[PDB]
Design a protein around this nucleic acid. Sequence first.
DNA 1: ACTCTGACGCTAGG
DNA 2: CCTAGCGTCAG
Length: 647
Amino acid sequence: KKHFCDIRHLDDWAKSQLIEMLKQAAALVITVMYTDGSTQLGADQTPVSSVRGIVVLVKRQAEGCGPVLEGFVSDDPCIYIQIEHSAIWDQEQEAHQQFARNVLFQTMKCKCPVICFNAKDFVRIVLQFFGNDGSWKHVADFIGLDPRIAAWLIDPSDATPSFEDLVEKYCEKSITVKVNSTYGNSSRNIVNQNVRENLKTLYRLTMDLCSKLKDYGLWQLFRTLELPLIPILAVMESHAIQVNKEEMEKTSALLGARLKELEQEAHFVAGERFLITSNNQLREILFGKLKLHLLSQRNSLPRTGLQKYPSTSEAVLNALRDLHPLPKIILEYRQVHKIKSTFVDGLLACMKKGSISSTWNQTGTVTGRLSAKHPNIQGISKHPIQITTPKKILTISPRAMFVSSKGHTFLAADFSQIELRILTHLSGDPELLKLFQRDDVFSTLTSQWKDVPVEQVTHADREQTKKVVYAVVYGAGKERLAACLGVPIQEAAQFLESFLQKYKKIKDFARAAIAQCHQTGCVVSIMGRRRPLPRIHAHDQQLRAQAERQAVNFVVQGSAADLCKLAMIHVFTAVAASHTLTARLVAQIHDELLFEVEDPQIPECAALVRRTMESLEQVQALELQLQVPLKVSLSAGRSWGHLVPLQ
DNA sequence: ACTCTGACGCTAGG
DNA sequence: CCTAGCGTCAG
């Protein structure tokens, strides 16, 4: 009515008054309206249509004086800002765009609370709307209150609740919302009225969720760590990483050829034509037909079976690699198929315009880690794999596909052995704490443990030490460890308990974490992220033990996640305030930050990055203090696959 | 013919 | 331990 305004049609004095209102507002409540018109308020999770505009409820008083008559608007008014392009571009569109950008920037820099249901989407839309006028540094300081993220911090198990869900759950009480109205199942007036009402309700819900966050002790985490990350993710989604289409296209062909060769060999040695991609048929061949479990390697496999017959898993197959020529073939086939199918064919399916951009999910996991999708840049092969060309030696690197846009170079910052250091901090183990006080830590760990001083003793042990380290880090077991490393259950158990009896504190830390869980009913990371595990109270001992394992794992994994997010935020903030530095965060591989930076700026930024990241050891606030320093490894290069170390 | 869905399995990243 | 993504297969 008078509560809904198109800012294009405001008189200019009213435009000025509007800007002043946005400056003096108590709270801003924002949702994105699509062409339906639907909203971020549900229940559709991904809009099949595109963005029409942004609706902003301007609250002149926040629930948690004196009358004002503005006269061009009522109290409290909803303003509408058109994002969508028109059919014809001209000067008037330029003008409209100018005022719109001014308003949206006022939304970005305002001193009041800004509540948006999905904040990253909104920030991204605004970021693309600014275009030329603005850079990513404009939105760096934006803090939206995202109720979804709050509800995620409370109950991490459910990643994607709708708005109507959250209202029912955390809103007290009896509030009904109609979020489903669109043009064509109803009028505008209905859509708009419901938008206003639902925006008010959104404010209510957000405030409730904030207080609950304060109750559960999650507030400082929410504000300090989760919220400042939103514009960072939005910026990463607003930038595309160039990739080679030509190269992939070829390689795909090559890998296809090799795959057929391998399929032919497999059918040859198996003694029949089966489905090379079917694990069931291979399961029947290896075991029902060739009967290899029964043969020399009996009980090498997990049991005579996991059930009747063992699995086709790489452990089982590696146990059989001497018995028959098939397992090796299946393995190489799996490797090549993985690379081609996912790292090339799928990466070709993602790209637009010589480049790809991953979608980031903050509420994605229960450990507090980020997840990346379509394509998952966190799951890209680290080590280049070698194949024998069909028709010389052929080398293939998936990470070599991602190249910087000259003139720019990639700058990668890795947290060295961060899980182990977090574990040291938590356990407070004397020997591990002695270990870090610089040069190739895992080797020195291998020596200190094995009491063998070999300068760089066996690489295989370097791998064994790592494998048992992670066997205990993600806890725990004799069986699973055994599966990782190629040795029998007893040997794995002895390796494990040797390690745990060399460092006593770790067992004590684990026991303490389990004790905490059962007591509270959840477990807590360093910065206060909580992982509820009700099955810790379960009478079933398998469930109980599983909950214990999860409890032990979440402390380490979640703490590492906290530190990575913190580093992300601190570096982003550090760069965002520079006269000079253009370095842009491109992606985060969990413990590795990947930047694209201007070629000349390399020494200046690499300084800033390492300085910023290493100082994360001591920070207030929160009362964060680490028992062990954080070593940061820097590298640079024109391609992601090839990065030459720096300093 | 065609496309979905959901249970199950493997492997890469950490 | 926990992700994304690629497979089969039956309905």
